[PDB]
Amino acid sequence: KSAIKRVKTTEKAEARNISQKSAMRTAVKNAKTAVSNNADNKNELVSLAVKLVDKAAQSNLIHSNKADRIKSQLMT
């Protein structure tokens, strides 16, 4: 039973990505609201952070690395 210790990573690895993912998407869900206003204040310098979390489809690899371009392919 050496997959007992594999379970303890599995309830532990859910927390890191689902925090990163839910912060990836609400930074992006507010972004297309900010891209619906386009005042260059609530959209600038966090859209590349919305692309840094779409670059954290390579850092936070729970979203797959080759799947980095499934959302970020339109705004920038």
Give yes or no for residue 75 binding RNA (CB under 7 A). no
Cβ closest to RNA, residue 30 vs residue 52: 52
Per-residue x/- track, 5-24, RNA (CB under 7 A):
xxxxxx-xxx-xxx------
Give yes or no for residue 59 binding RNA (CB under 7 A). yes
Give how many residues touch RNA by CB under 7 A: 34
Burial pattern 26-60, b for ≥16 Cβ within 10 A else e, equals ebbeebeebeeeeeeeebeebbebbbebbebbeeb
